[PDB]
Amino acid sequence: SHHWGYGKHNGPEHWHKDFPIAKGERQSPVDIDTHTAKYDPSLKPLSVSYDQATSLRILNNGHAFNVEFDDSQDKAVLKGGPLDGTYRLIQFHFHWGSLDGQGSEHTVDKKKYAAELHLVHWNTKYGDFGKAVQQPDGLAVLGIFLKVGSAKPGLQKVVDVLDSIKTKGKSADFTNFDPRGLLPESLDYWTYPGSLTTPPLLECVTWIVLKEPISVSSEQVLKFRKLNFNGEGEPEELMVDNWRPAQPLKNRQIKASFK
Numbered sequence: 001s002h003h004w005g006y007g008k009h010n011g012p013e014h015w016h017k018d019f020p021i022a023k024g025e026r027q028s029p030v031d032i033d034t035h036t037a038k039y040d041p042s043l044k045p046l047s048v049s050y051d052q053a054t055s056l057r058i059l060n061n062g063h064a065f066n067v068e069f070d071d072s073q074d075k076a077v078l079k080g081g082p083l084d085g086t087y088r089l090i091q092f093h094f095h096w097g098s099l100d101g102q103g104s105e106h107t108v109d110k111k112k113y114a115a116e117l118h119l120v121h122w123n124t125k126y127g128d129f130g131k132a133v134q135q136p137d138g139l140a141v142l143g144i145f146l147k148v149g150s151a152k153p154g155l156q157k158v159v160d161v162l163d164s165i166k167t168k169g170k171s172a173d174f175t176n177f178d179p180r181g182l183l184p185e186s187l188d189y190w191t192y193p194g195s196l197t198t199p200p201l202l203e204c205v206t207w208i209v210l211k212e213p214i215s216v217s218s219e220q221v222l223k224f225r226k227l228n229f230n231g232e233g234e235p236e237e238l239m240v241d242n243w244r245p246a247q248p249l250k251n252r253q254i255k256a257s258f259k
């Protein structure tokens with residue numbers, strides 16, 4: 001099984017062979033050109049209601065780690081912004097680099113952040129996640145940039161469990177994590193229509209990318225980089241540089257919620 005990954009032989013420029021939509025019309029991520037993105041006064045404020053969020057578990061899937069939520073009721077929800085309807089939080093994960101100068105998927109005027117957080121939500125009108133990903137308005141992913149400087153106290157709970165899920169296929173109980181602790185002050189955002197940034201690369205995402213990055217410490221991101229792509233008792237490949245680069249914008253407009 002020579003499966004997709006991020007190395008020289010199985011990384012982003014190889015994905016099209018198995019997933020031809022990789023060269024499609026609405027692929028993510030993209031470079032966000034701040035001078036070309038237009039203020040859209042019709043865009044609403046983003047409504048992030050995470051007060052009843054229920055985390056269940058954390059998993060290393062060999063590509064990143066996913067913190068999963070119970071999405072069997074309208075607990076943690078995203079709405080307003082560019083969205084019509086209600087989208088439920090299912091999981092969050094991050095993408096990061098081998099060094100602080102790279103790691104984000106989206107870029108801002110070609111600037112790369114040290115990492116990027118993705119909070120993944122599905123449109124409740126489609127009833128389940130698997131059905132949502134087959135729809136052009138099926139998912140809403142909230143993207144949040146990470147830069148290195150001061151520690152984020154709301155992240156440390158995640159950092160401290162990574163020891164227990166070092167390799168691919170390991171999981172641990174991860175209850176009562178509050179993702180409000182990962183949010184920046186301002187909910188100003190850019191939005192555009194896009195895709196999942198890993199295979200199957202489905203073109204089903206309304207991207208909402210926050211302008212304000214959060215700060216995490218060097219020590220926090222260092223612990224991300226101690227994870228492993230490989231499974232237990234296999235040769236060690238550190239989980240670093242699990243980001244797809246910017247893809248062509250083609251026939252698409254990036255709108256800003258702010259002036």
Ligand SMILES: COc1ccc2c(ccc[n+]2C(=O)c2ccc(S(N)(=O)=O)cc2)c1
Pocket residue numbers: 118120133141195196197198199200
């Ligand atoms: C077998 O069960 C699974 C597991 C993961 C699946 C998935 C269906 C599509 C993509 N994924 C995702 O959940 C996924 C992949 C990428 C992104 S991203 N990085 O936010 O665009 C979000 C979500 C099914």
Ligand SMILES: [Zn+2]
Pocket residue numbers: 093094095118197
């Ligand atoms: Zn992602």
